[PDB]
Design a binder for these strands. Sequence first.
DNA 1: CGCTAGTGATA
DNA 2: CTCGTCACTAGCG
Length: 348
Amino acid sequence: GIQGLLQFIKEASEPIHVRKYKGQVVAVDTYCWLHKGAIACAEKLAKGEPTDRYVGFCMKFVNMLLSHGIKPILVFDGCTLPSKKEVERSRRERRQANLLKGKQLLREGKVSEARECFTRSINITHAMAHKVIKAARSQGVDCLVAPYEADAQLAYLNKAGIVQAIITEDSDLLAFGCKKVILKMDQFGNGLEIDQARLGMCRQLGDVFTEEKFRYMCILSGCDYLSSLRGIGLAKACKVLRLANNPDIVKVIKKIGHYLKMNITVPEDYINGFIRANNTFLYQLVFDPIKRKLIPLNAYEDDVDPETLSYAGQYVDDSIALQIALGNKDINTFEQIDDYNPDTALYF
DNA sequence: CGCTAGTGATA
DNA sequence: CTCGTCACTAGCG
Ligand code: NA
């Protein structure tokens, strides 16, 4: 996502412990636990050999949060946004390559390299995530499969007061407008918290501590929805945002070469791609657990047409979205793989 | 000299 | 059949 974002605003970071959120609700970007837990049993998944260590891993963290008296809500990624299809396919091809080479080209002789390639060809499937969901629900923990990206869903849960903090390793959460994000948490509950209001503690940031300006900085720096101009990182983006007074971001991006004293010819596609990136950060589709329907991250403004925001995810029926959120309906085939019912046991 | 972006080691 | 990350630094303006 946003490279070097954590180091850039480390002044706003506060080392905490999970006790600080006792008797409160916290949402967890489960994919990080799933991935770090799958790294341990990489060769097992590479060979196609049955294993469930990652389940015990995720449940270890969950049991920690529970032991400190916190109500955790596990969140998973759902469908992939159209602005990421070819990227996910690229990573798919990379995993296929690392698996093929790591297997056939390293089946005899070299072993360490074969494992080093197998750990790269590791793919987190929704079946594994479903195992985690079954275990978590067996331990009475609520789960939610996002309609699309997990970071938007989490940001919604946080901005709606449903949760008070978000445990993740992704730095993009801040660009979605989260209030409290707990990064780099270990087994015991030791992690780095970053509050939105505390963004002002960064002198280097200047007057770019407001949600909108901070978002513009994150996008200009280089995000998953849009690569940055060559030579533009966090410092340069922050600088050009600090210097410019004009509220209209388009003219600013057009004069990015003027404000930074460096020869930059802004591509025709970059402005539209910027608007699309910002619109994706603002209006990506999430699932409202209370109303049990599919809503945008933020309510649409007066200058935006919903029919042109297909890249921020497309709507489906609320019953289908509900079945997806419960992990009952498969992401790809849309087939019913489970029959969990929250009525006959959140979502109330 | 500040800052971007790529590499190598690593689980 | 869902996303890496960090320390170090070459090399840019
Ligand atoms: Na960049």
